[PDB]
């Protein structure tokens, strides 16, 4: 996260770290959506242009964390993966359309002050909150600048951007399964996700029921925190029928 701040303890209890077993390293962010299910970006697991194709046994998820590098004894919980599910129409060839994946844990995780699931949006919450200018929150342990790494989880609040501005900022083809967020050059505030934050959550706090909803997944950007560029996020609600189908079937 660029131009963010240290998270408070328990501020993002749905935040998950995707952790490579060997070598031991941070791969991506992710989020807890129930006691057995974790949501992330498909490109965190499958990206053939970079020879990336992780299997269940390559990875762990670490839940309840604050410190990036410490083993947080008696606080964090480490889970093995039972199964990975990638969206069948995830477009890794072109523009990362439908950049979403689910991971089922081998055993349920115990909730605690530090471990708690985020809500997924219904149609009405999405329609009400996914509006240009409305701010969400991005969290992660990724790099602090494009060109370094944080001691603890970082947090930044960023406004959703009008779709024409998103499209006009890039040569990539933008789809309805994406939205973008960030400040404009003239707005005098800054901030972005960066390398290692992808797969983590973009959340909004509903003013109707005071619950946190995951509206986006950190998906892609051109650099980090560049003027006139924006971060792009998987539109969770647009893909919720697939989420529901996976959880119902499996």
């Amino acid at each position: 996260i660029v131009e963010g701040s240290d998270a408070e303890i328990g501020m993002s209890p749905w935040q998950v770290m995707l952790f490579r077993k060997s070598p031991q390293e941070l791969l991506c962010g992710a989020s807890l959506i129930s006691d057995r299910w974790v949501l992330t970006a498909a490109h965190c697991l499958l990206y053939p242009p970079w020879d990336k194709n992780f299997t269940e046994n390559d990875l762990l998820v670490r839940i309840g964390k604050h410190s990036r590098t410490r083993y947080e004894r008696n606080i964090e919980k480490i889970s093995m993966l039972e199964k990975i599910y990638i969206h069948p129409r995830y477009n890794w060839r072109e523009n990362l359309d439908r950049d979403i994946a689910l991971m089922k844990l081998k055993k349920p995780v115990a909730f605690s002050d530090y471990i708690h699931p985020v809500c997924l949006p219904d149609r009405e919450t999405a329609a009400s909150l996914l509006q240009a200018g409305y701010k969400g929150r991005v969290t992660g342990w990724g790099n602090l600048k494009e060109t370094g790494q944080p001691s603890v989880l970082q947090v930044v609040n960023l406004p959703i951007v009008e779709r024409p501005v998103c499209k006009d900022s890039t040569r990539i083809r933008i789809t309805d399964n994406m939205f973008c967020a960030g400040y404009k050059p003239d707005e005098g505030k800054r901030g972005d996700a960066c390398e290692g934050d992808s797969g983590g959550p973009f959340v909004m706090k509903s003013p109707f029921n005071n619950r946190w909803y995951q509206m986006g997944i950190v998906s892609w950007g051109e650099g980090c925190d560049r003027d006139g560029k924006y971060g792009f996020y998987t539109h969770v609600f647009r893909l919720k029928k697939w989420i529901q189908k996976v959880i119902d079937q499996f």
Partner: peptide, 28 residues
């Protein structure tokens, strides 16, 4: 799921984090 999105150390105690008000103020 019933309890989703309500943080033990914040909403469940009626404590506000340091920047959530920035989000609320944007929901015009």
């Amino acid at each position: 799921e019933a309890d989703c999105g309500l943080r033990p150390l914040f909403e469940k105690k009626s404590l506000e984090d340091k920047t959530e008000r920035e989000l609320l103020e944007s929901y015009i």
